[PDB]
Amino acid sequence: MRLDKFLKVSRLIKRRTLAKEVADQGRISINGNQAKASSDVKPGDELTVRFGQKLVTVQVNELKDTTKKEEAANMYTILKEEKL
Amino acid sequence: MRVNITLACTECGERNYISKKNKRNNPDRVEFKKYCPRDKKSTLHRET
Amino acid sequence: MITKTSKNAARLKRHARVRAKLSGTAERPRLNVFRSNKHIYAQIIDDVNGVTLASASTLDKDLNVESTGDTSAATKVGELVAKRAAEKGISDVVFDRGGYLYHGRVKALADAAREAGLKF
Amino acid sequence: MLLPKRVKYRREHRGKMRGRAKGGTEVHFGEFGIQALEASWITNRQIEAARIAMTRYMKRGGKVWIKIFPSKPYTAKPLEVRMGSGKGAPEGWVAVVKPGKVLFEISGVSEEVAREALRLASHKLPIKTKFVKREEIG
Amino acid sequence: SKKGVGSTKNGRDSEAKRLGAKRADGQFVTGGSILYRQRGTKIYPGENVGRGGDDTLFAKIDGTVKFERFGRDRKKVSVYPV
Amino acid sequence: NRLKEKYNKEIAPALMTKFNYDSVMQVPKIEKIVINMGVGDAVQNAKAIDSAVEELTFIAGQKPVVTRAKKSIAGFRLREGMPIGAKVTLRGERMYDFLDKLISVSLPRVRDFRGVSKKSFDGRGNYTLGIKEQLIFPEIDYDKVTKVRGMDIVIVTTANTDEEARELLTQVGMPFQK
RNA sequence: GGUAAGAGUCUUGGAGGUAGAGCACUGAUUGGACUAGGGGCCCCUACCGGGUUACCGAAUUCAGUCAAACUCCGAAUGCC
RNA sequence: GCGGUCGCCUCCUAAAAGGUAACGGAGGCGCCCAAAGGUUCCCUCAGAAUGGUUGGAAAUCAUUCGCAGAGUGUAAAGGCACAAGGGAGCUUGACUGCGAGACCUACAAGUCGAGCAGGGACGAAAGUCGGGCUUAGUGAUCCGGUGGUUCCGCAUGGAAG
RNA sequence: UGGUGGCGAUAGCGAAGAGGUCACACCCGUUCCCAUACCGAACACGGAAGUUAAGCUCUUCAGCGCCGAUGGUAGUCGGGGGUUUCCCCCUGUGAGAGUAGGACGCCGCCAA
RNA sequence: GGGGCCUUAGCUCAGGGGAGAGCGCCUGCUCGCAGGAGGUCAGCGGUUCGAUCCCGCUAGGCUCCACCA
Structure with missing residues (x-):
């Protein structure tokens, strides 16, 4: 699915507009290379989403489009977090 | 889940019978003894 | 309160379900056994004329038992039924067990009839 | 406005209207009534019109017994279409009325009030009508 | 101005199976032949008449077909030898 | 077996001297006592069915069996399987x-029961009494x-x-509300 | 070629539910008793209940209707 | 043109044998079940009321009134409590070669079938069993795949076929 | 009187009397053959203490249920005529409902 | 008028065993938290033990057609 859709369903960014703006500002990289707001993701990718002074790197496990927390916190797996 | 199966005789070896079974209810191999036309007797038949 | 049916009431339904399976009318008659609380009766009935070919019981002037249908001495009247069958030239019968489960002492009468000449 | 709120089938054959009335021939609830002389379908709108026409002129008096009920539906294909291509949608409800059948029943008023009310009902109906009363042999 | 409408959704039917009586009362019948075709036991088998797996009534011996009744609302087919 | 001799020696002439009878022998015997559980598992969660049925073995000496539903009812399904509740029919001299x-x-x-069934008959001769706890039977242990x-x-x-x-x-000898 | 079976009529015996009738089922129903339950209003409700309802009607019942996919019945003709 | 439909099964239309059309009116099927199959032995369903502690209109239990208002895998008709409807024991006949005689009728095809032989299952025996209460759950030929085969195999013996 | 069969609930439900010493039935116990998803309630065994109270047979009630005419009527084969989404005559067949009535059982075999 | 897709919190949308997000409103806690008000799942009626989930219809909102003389 799309990057902003994946960030919406994975609850990393709760709003799709904010995820779209973050990915359009050149902050999120998939498998090392920079990408736009619509890069297709696969289970087994290494996301490099950048918050405000954060370096959260997660791992994709599954892809399901459910807007409920019972079936949402099982797709991303945190690997390491870096403040700066 | 309902597939075509054949039943060969354990003694004669020929595939004498065909039937159907459900794989979910019967995962194991079935064992029905039937009449064997070559052996002139009722022998155990095994699914192959 | 409870007004449950008698043992003879379900026995008639059991007799009806038994007599549906075997006709008893192919020039080969049937051997009917009635087990009462005191002694046993035996009759041979064939359709369609309904005549009784042979009948015998413990309740008779002859054949002092004198058990009168408790022990395995019922085999005496069980073979005497076959005696009245053989004196009238009956070749073979079927066994009409009635509403009684075949485990005795109706089975004793059937075995006594089998040993005395009735080939059923 | 009379109609069944549930039916077994919404589309039925139109049927036939041969012979006299099978039942409802004799007046036995009210004192006076209308006896049908010809057979046609009676729409529930006509039944409502006849009932209001009787009830208004009988503002003081007894109640009206409606002996007929529009249980049979009729289907009406939409206009300007070709013939066939399926049966049309049901439009309304009619009652199959045979000659000799009693339609409406009145008791508890005078003779001329009942006659004028039945005349006002009969002028709304599409069938030939007559005035009948209860006979006591008996 | 032509306008279209649809559809029927009820335009299918199964093939009719030729049930009913196949022989008549008083007719000579050969053994094994079909007497009456059934869906369920509308008419019961009687003397020298069997019932098939499709509830088909057939004569068991050669004879003459007689239609009788059990009573009160039950029927029978019987074949009596000549 | 003491009550078996007791009723035949005391109540059997007492009924016939109470009012007249056509038959001298007609004393009404007792026929069946049934014990009904109706657990429901509160609700469908207690998986110890085999211990729930063996809880009834302390009350009645015969082995009880579980009963199975005949019609599913929308409140507490209980489909056609999963037998919930227990029925034991005990007979003999054990009445x-x-x-x-x-x-x-x-x-x-019982702390509050002083009289049961002054009006609770069926019209054809039934007595049915309700028991709420297990402490009533003295053979049931407190642990x-x-x-x-x-x-x-x-x-x-x-x-x-x-x-x-x-x-x-x-x-x-069984008291009433009166 | 078979040969005289074929057909009509009188007599007899059958199968099959149409016309008509009927509620004995399945629906839809109209009226009266009967009123499970719901509607306002007074004592009260911080809440249980009671009264009147010229108030609606799921049950059930005495009646009155209707039905191609309703039949306790049931023809005349046709059929064998 | 577009929309819809194309094969099979059930009811009505269908006119009291059978059959019978329309882009007529209603629904289902391209399965399921090693058991819901076979045999033997027992039993009778749904709802109303009373009484019951967690039960209130309904969970479970006793009683009456209950010829069926229940159930019959799946869906309509026909039928079934002398149960084909429910419960247990043992089993695989859910069989090999057949099959007198029949039903439908363009053909192809489809359906029932007494009874014989070989081997069984259940039952003391009589007897029943060649799938499910019946009627749908399925498609030709050609061409290939697999197993068997005292069949042929291009001069002979094999092999390819 | 008991067993066992054939006649379309004219064979049944409901009420009231009568029977038991023979027979049939309840009834009484589990040691045996056999048992229930459990249980001598059911199916088995052994006993004649207590009884017709129930089961069963006979005798009267037509309340419910059942069978059921004659006449009439509806319908209808065939022929004919109109005012032709229907109606009216003629020859012949002829319902359903209702009514009069019947009915609280007959016909066999064997044993006692 | 005829096909296809929906009618779900105040708004916008996911979704046979008993249904949810972001925004809008609150609740104590010093850029994010863990909880609550609000749902005839547009309505009726059938298949079973229950329907947002399967179906026959009524209103409504989008999309594609309504052509040849």
Whole structure:
């Protein structure tokens, strides 16, 4: 699915507009290379989403489009977090 | 889940019978003894 | 309160379900056994004329038992039924067990009839 | 406005209207009534019109017994279409009325009030009508 | 101005199976032949008449077909030898 | 077996001297006592069915069996399977051996029960009494599962009228509300 | 070629539910008793209940209707 | 043109044998079940009321009134409590070669079938069993795949076929 | 009187009397053959203490249920005529409902 | 008028065993938290033990057609 859709369903960014703006500002990289707001993701990718002074790197496990927390916190797996 | 199966005789070896079974209810191999036309007797038949 | 049916009431339904399976009318008659609380009766009935070919019981002037249908001495009247069958030239019968489960002492009468000449 | 709120089938054959009335021939609830002389379908709108026409002129008096009920539906294909291509949608409800059948029943008023009310009902109906009363042999 | 409408959704039917009586009362019948075709036991088998797996009534011996009744609302087919 | 001799030696002439009979022998015997559980598992969650049925073995000496549903009901399904509740039908001289300890200790042990069924007859001679706890039976130990499990009893009298069944259960020794 | 079976009529015996009738089922129903339950209003409700309802009607019942996919019945003709 | 439909099964239309059309009116099927199959032995369903502690209109239990208002895998008709409807024991006949005689009728095809022989299952025996209460759950030929085969195999013996 | 069969609930439900010493039935116990998803309630065994109270047979009630005419009527084969989404005559067949009535059982075999 | 897709919190949308997000409103806690008000799942009626989930219809909102003389 799309990057902003994946960030919406994975609850990393709760709003799709904010995820779209973050990915359009050149902050999120998939498998090392920079990408736009619509890069297709696969289970087994290494996301490099950048918050405000954060370096959260997660791992994709599954892809399901459910807007409920019972079936949402099982797709991303945190690997390491870096403040700066 | 309902597939075509054949039943060969354990003694004669020929595939004498065909039937159907459900794989979910019967995962194991079935064992029905039937009449064997070559052996002139009722022998155990095994699914192959 | 409870007004449950008698043992003879379900026995008639059991007799009806038994007599549906075997006709008893192919020039080969049937051997009917009635087990009462005191002694046993035996009759041979064939359709369609309904005549009784042979009948015998413990309740008779002859054949002092004198058990009168408790022990395995019922085999005496069980073979005497076959005696009245053989004196009238009956070749073979079927066994009409009635509403009684075949485990005795109706089975004793059937075995006594089998040993005395009735080939059923 | 009379109609069944549930039916077994919404589309039925139109049927036939041969012979006299099978039942409802004799007046036995009210004192006076209308006896049908010809057979046609009676729409529930006509039944409502006849009932209001009787009830208004009988503002003081007894109640009206409606002996007929529009249980049979009729289907009406939409206009300007070709013939066939399926049966049309049901439009309304009619009652199959045979000659000799009693339609409406009145008791508890005078003779001329009942006659004028039945005349006002009969002028709304599409069938030939007559005035009948209860006979006591008996 | 032509306008279209649809559809029927009820335009299918199964093939009719030729049930009913196949022989008549008083007719000579050969053994094994079909007497009456059934869906369920509308008419019961009687003397020298069997019932098939499709509830088909057939004569068991050669004879003459007689239609009788059990009573009160039950029927029978019987074949009596000549 | 003491009550078996007791009723034949005391109540059997007492009924025939109470009012006239066509038959000298017609004393109404007892037929069946059934115990009904109806657990429901509160609700469908207690998977210890085999212990719930064996809880009834302390009350009635015969082995009880579970009962199965005949129609699913929308409140607490309970489909056609999963047998919930227990029914035991106990017969023999064990009616007499059960009613002896019943009218001995079971009725006065209840803290609030002083009289049951002044109007609760069926019209054809039924007595049915409700038990809420397990502490009523003295053979039930206090170190049990301790959850509230209730008993049910149904007394079947051979006499077909209320006026006969009431006058037998008054003089057999089982008290009434009055 | 078979040969005289074929057909009509009188007599007899059958199968099959149409016309008509009927509620004995399945629906839809109209009226009266009967009133499960719901509607306002007074004592009260911080809440249980009671009264009147010229108030609606799921049950059930005495009646009155209707039906191609309703039949306790049931023709005349046709059929064998 | 577009929309819809194309094969099979059930009811009505269908006119009291059978059959009978329309882009007529209603629904289902391209399965399921090693058991819901076979045999033997037992039993009778749904709802109303009374009484019951967690039960209130309904969970479970006793009673009456209950010829069926229940159930019959799946869906309509026909039928079934002398149960084909429910419960247990043992089993695989859910069989090999057949089959007198029949039903439908363009053909192809489809359906029932007494009874014989070989081997069984259940039952003391009589007897029943060649799938499910019946009627749908399925498609030709050609061409290939697999197993068997005292069949042929291009001069002979094999092999390819 | 008991067993066992054939006649379309004219064979049944409901009420009231009568029977038991023979027979049939309840009834009484589990040691045996056999048992229930459990249980001598059911199916088995052994006993004649207590009884017709129930089961069963006979005798009267037509309340419910059942069978059921004659006449009439509806319908209808065939022929004919109009005012032709229907109606009216003629020859012949002829319902359903209702009514009069019948009915609280007959016909066999064997044993006692 | 005829096909296809929906009618779900105040708004916008996911979704046979008993249904949810972001925004809008609150609740104590010093850029994010863990909880609550609000749902005839547009309505009726059938298949079973229950329907947002399967179906026959009524209103409504989008999309594609309504052509040849």
